[PDB]
Ligand binder design. Sequence first.
Ligand SMILES: [Mg+2]
Ligand SMILES: [Mg+2]
Ligand SMILES: [Mg+2]
Ligand SMILES: [Mg+2]
Ligand SMILES: [Mg+2]
Ligand SMILES: [Mg+2]
Ligand SMILES: [Mg+2]
Ligand SMILES: [Mg+2]
Lengths: 134, 260, 205
Amino acid sequence: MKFNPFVTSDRSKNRKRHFNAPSHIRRKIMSSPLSKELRQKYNVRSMPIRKDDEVQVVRGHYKGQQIGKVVQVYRKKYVIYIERVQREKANGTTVHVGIHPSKVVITRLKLDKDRKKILERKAKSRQVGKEKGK
Amino acid sequence: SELAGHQTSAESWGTGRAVARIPRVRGGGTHRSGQGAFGNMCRGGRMFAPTKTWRRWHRRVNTTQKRYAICSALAASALPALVMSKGHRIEEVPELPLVVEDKVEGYKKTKEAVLLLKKLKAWNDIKKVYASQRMRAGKGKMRNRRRIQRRGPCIIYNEDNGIIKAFRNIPGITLLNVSKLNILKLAPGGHVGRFCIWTESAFRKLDELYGTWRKAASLKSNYNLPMHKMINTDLSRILKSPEIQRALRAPRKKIHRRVL
Amino acid sequence: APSRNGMVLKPHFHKDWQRRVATWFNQPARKIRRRKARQAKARRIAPRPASGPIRPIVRCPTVRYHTKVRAGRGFSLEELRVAGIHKKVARTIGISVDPRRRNKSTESLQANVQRLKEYRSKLILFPRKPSAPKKGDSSAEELKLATQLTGPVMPVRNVYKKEKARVITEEEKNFKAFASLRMARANARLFGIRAKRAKEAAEQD
RNA sequence: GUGGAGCCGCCGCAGGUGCAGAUCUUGGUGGUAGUAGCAAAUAUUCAAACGAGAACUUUGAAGGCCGAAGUGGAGAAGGG
RNA sequence: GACCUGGGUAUAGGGGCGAAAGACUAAUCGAACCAUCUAGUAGCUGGUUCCCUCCGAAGUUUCCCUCAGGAUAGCUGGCG
RNA sequence: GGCGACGUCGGCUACCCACCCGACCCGUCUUGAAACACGGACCAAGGAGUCUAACACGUGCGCGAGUCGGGGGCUCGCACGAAAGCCGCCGUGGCGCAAUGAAGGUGAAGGCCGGCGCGCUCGCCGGCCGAGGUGGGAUCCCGAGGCCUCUCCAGUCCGCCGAGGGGCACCACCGGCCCGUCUCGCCCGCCGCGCCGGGGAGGUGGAGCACGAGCGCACGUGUUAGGACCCGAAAGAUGGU
RNA sequence: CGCGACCUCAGAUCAGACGUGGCGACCCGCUGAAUUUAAGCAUAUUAGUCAGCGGAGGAAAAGAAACUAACCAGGAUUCCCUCAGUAACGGCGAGUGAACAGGGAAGAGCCCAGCGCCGAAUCCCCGCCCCGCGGGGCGCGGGACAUGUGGCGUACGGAAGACCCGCUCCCCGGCGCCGCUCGUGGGGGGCCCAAGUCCUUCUGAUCGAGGCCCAGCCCGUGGACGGUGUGAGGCCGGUAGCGGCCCCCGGCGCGCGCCCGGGUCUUCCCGGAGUCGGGUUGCUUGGGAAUGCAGCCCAAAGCGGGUGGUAAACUCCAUCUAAGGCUAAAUACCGGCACGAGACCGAUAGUCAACAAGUACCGUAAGGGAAAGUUGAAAAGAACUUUGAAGAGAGAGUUCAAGAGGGCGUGAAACCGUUAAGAGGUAAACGGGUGGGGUCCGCGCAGUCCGCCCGGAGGAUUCAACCCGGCGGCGGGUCCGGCCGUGUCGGCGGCCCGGCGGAUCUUUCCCGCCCCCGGGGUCGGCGGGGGACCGUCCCCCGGACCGGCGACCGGCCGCCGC
RNA sequence: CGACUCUUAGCGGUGGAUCACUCGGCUCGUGCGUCGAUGAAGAACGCAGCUAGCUGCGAGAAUUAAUGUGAAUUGCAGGACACAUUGAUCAUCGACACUUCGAACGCACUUGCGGCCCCGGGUUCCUCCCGGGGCUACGCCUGUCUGAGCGUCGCUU
Ligand SMILES: [Mg+2]
Ligand SMILES: [Mg+2]
Ligand SMILES: [Mg+2]
Ligand SMILES: [Mg+2]
Ligand SMILES: [Mg+2]
Ligand SMILES: [Mg+2]
Ligand SMILES: [Mg+2]
Ligand SMILES: [Mg+2]
């Protein structure tokens, strides 16, 4: 149950803060879970997805053992595009059909200098949760 | 209806002109220029008897009836016919004023909470609350209450040592204090007989919190427990008593139907 | 407009009263706003007592209420004069002062002097750094509690006497009667008239 | 049968509680009706071209009109 | 010609201005228009939304600036 | 008892059609509407007895000569909790428990017994008690007598019981008491002997007394004040263009 | 005649400050109606409200008695509950209408002119410095202010000075840093539990089923919302005195700055004027032989003045000290900036406005002022062929669905088109009663009964009766072991290692005092504690009844499944 | 036979009711309670690669710097992907800048007309010579400077 008297619980106002989100808050709500292998090597649960992570789709019309990298992150439509899952148009032109990153499992991260520190910050705070158990 | 629906300039057209004598809006140009203005008939009009914020919202109950209602809500939570006919699955449970010892007030983890309800055979009531995880029928869903849920058992205590945290995550449960009870919790819906789990030091404080008929309550300054209109209530025994059926006539068990 | 046997009534609603309306919807909200203004005033001050200074014994005016005892305003400089404390020292001792109050009885004077010295004998002061004039050792062994509740010396304590049992004797069962009420009430209003006729026989020669 | 995401029974509780009319309000659509009307200031016709397509466009020839207080040629105000 | 007119200027609502018609004052004049007080008042019109069961009227008395209205008694229903 | 197969059997609706009989178009004011009275072309949705305050009575509940926290106060910092819980040397106060008079003010218990003073149309002391009396009065109590397979002896019971008794609430009546006024009158009292206090007996005026029934909450009807069931003027005022 | 001083005034784009205007929900000062009510209408009511004008502030205003009271007296203001729909006002009609006690919320008090005293002991500006950060000074030197009076000590609760008497060395800010902060100070960012497991339905799952005797996993986290549909676990989050980061605040301790109070006696001092008050005229009030205010006229006193709710005279008492000033809190808030919630509305509703809404448009203007939400999960928005000049089609194609084709969810009625059926000179429609036809449903069609008991004809399995083994219930009994209900007590037991209650008692108990001659008298009590008594509730032995839905064991009877 | 008319039913059209949805109101409450001459509220005009509105901004104009954040913005293009430079975007915002009117301030409001002071060049300049900068409203307080008076008086002559 929510106890804080300074955070909402109403349907109209969490939706309004969802679709009118700032574009740096919006990379946080477009987070995706790490794979079972890769959450054990880093002891972290989930990550915000960036442009060049290898990924497979875990639910939808297009799913099942399809590692392949994302190629475009529409934050405006809350949608990542992945380089293999595609769709022919009526024209014969082929386009990327887009999916939501919660329906998606990262299988290989792209590390830079900053995505080391985002991992280590989310990892070091998880021993502190285990250190509460006295 | 905030200020009023009376923020419109409008006169009646008055005279002939073959229109009804409702006020019309002024001016021209715009659509809303000769249309029926304020009054409870018009598109954009003012409602009949607009609700006021000084409606008498709140009701008083005198305190001897509040205490009367809470004594009748506890006496029905011990009769097994009334607590089961409100729907609580108390088939497998032992003795109806369930009393666990005062060690249970110091649980600080809900894993200890759930095995308590399993070993008290009351978990099959919580499992009935999981069956009622419905969503609301109607327009109350967009007034931010969506999920309907049964009320289950309630656990009553005194001297909290962590009991309020161990049980509150289990869905459909209620925790109220034995010093400050609530008729809105002990009888949801207005119907009597909610299933309750007592704790010893809560179950013993009731003797000094409402009194017996010999001595008044000590923690309530001028209150005793309400007397009875009926001492004996089983009239399958009064009407079969030898004092009564000595004095009765005889039963008249012909019919004497209509004679052609 | 009236009907059968009813009440003739004057509702005072002949004036535009829906603008001047007062609803008490913020009244639980202001009860927890002045509890938090008492709690954050209790912990802000000191171990000094909550609900402020010591109030005097005061008797109410006006025949209907003159048999009860009420908490007053200050301590009426004469009572501060007899108790021995100075008028500008007293309000940081925790003692309320009302300089415009009069003492014209003696029993109600001596009651509050007894009250004021009983307060001084149950008070512990704190020196800033432990010099302690008029004050000795450890602070009554840390003063037995922290802060009091709704009155330092229980401001009302309206008390009544015992008057156990007496014997119905002579001169008590026989005199002080209804005739004493009627004759004393009549002499209260026939006093100035009878003192006028006495002047008229004094200028009689 | 259509439709595509919510809903209902019983026990109490609460109402902005049930329409045929108010020359009611708002929106919609009929009959009338393919009807009344497309009639102030005299007037058009022939060929060609361009065009999917010409009583009405342009061009040429004819017949006419305004007739210098103009149906001409310029402005002020107003429009933009 | 007490002539006709443009532009500028002055007069503003119980006021203006009038060779006077109660004319004109922005299609409004025997007191403009705009917003408000204001959901002004109406003994006077028109309307007043589901079913079944049971009972069932009155247009008369007296008073009222009363006569299109009320108060009063009668007639009515419901509770006992 | 009898009759009948692959197109028949039974069935009725917001199906259609026919016939015979009946049948003027609704709403509305009105003595009287099918009206040559008014409103209504059609369809959809919106659309009119509300709410607050006061009072009255009825009813339901809690307590009951009391009742009521409504305003405050207390309880870890808790979603629901603007809830609930408690106070009582927080009952102040409200209404009720007492009325009457313009007011000063005054302010609701009687009967019997036994005696005595002119048992004087008047009264006094002591006891017994204690809301008087009459007429009706549900219920209850007593009840001779009455009712049982053979006769004299004994038991519970029940039904029938003329009559008699104590009589609820309530109604009618009579008496009584308290206050305001009236008339007629005599007596008593003393923080002081007076243009002083108190008493009496009859008659009238009072929203009184005569062994208390109220308070709080809820609901319903009614009346009122508010825009007040909905819509409706001709106006009046203030400030401006 | 000139110059000087001052006093009245001018000028300046003089050096430096200030004010104007907006918003206006709440607050203060003025000004001010009429509709309405009175069944008409003048006074009255509406209403001292609307409109008008002017000033603020986060609050404002009020505020430390020229008060209430009339007795055992209270003691600034403001708010709340009562007082109270009361006193009172009123064509005494309609109507209007306070306060003082009392209970609370909050509580805080002061300064000045005057009268005296101190050699103006005071203040402002300029210049350079002590020495400084983020700039203000106490120090130094010049120009002014000011004796027509700056400052100190003083304020009606009295004050000052001189005595005498017994004490005491203080407070304030600034600087650096350490130690906290009751919800655990504030602001800001970024982090923190657990299925995407197996089967299955689907356009797509968040569906449905399942996880050993550890209850599949987490829970101080089963709020919410977004994700191809209903999600504790996929994802933000939510939970937690979770953690770490950045900035900021209120308060200990080194250096400045400031520092004799109280009591008793003695003497001296001691107060606000064109104001009070009176007359008169207006408005206002519940204020009535005038509550308040204001104009004009008259105009004070000093044991005085004001008030004491019926005009006036006399008299006594009570109470306060006006005509100068400041002041927090409790209170208000339909504007603003942020928040949170709802038995609220659901696109003719709810704001006029869910949308490019105070917008388009209207009016010379002041001003008036709308209508207008929805494809899909994802544009995958119909390439291409073919007819046409094109709009528009016919195929194809996407999609679960185009029966979702760009105002596209669902798609009602009125009205229209066509198809199918039926009918048609008394306009149509209706009521009743049948008939005929049609759509369709049910039986299934000369093929309809169903279970019970009995005797028939065979077929196939095993119990019953009986008894023994066996646990389990039903009913009655000594209430035998345990048992509680109610009067009766007793052990006064627990009363001093027992609870509460009493307007019971005790003047011999214990503490600080009054009434008379250092002591004392119960000599009558005061404020409080103590301990007896009574009323009710906590055990032990006996005794009383029932063993009451409060029960177990034994035996009994008759069931029951194995 | 056909047509017309009428009533039903199927389908189609018109129309947009109902239902389901909701980044909106509405009510209540809490916390703070902040404009302006140092130029406010409001208005006008302008600003984007394609850009009318809305929204946001001011010739630094669809935003600059800084801090925080850590790979996008997106209708299509274009461009630096560089981040062990400085780092896209977004939020915060304490640094800068902020056209014209407006209390609106040189005067007028006609984009009209100036006045002094200064600066870069032309007469190497006074007496009205291009551009740029600065200043020029009213009321008022304290101080200053200038000085008016048959106001009051002194010292004089
Ligand atoms: Mg909300
Ligand atoms: Mg619905
Ligand atoms: Mg009719
Ligand atoms: Mg007027
Ligand atoms: Mg301000
Ligand atoms: Mg519409
Ligand atoms: Mg930047
Ligand atoms: Mg210049």
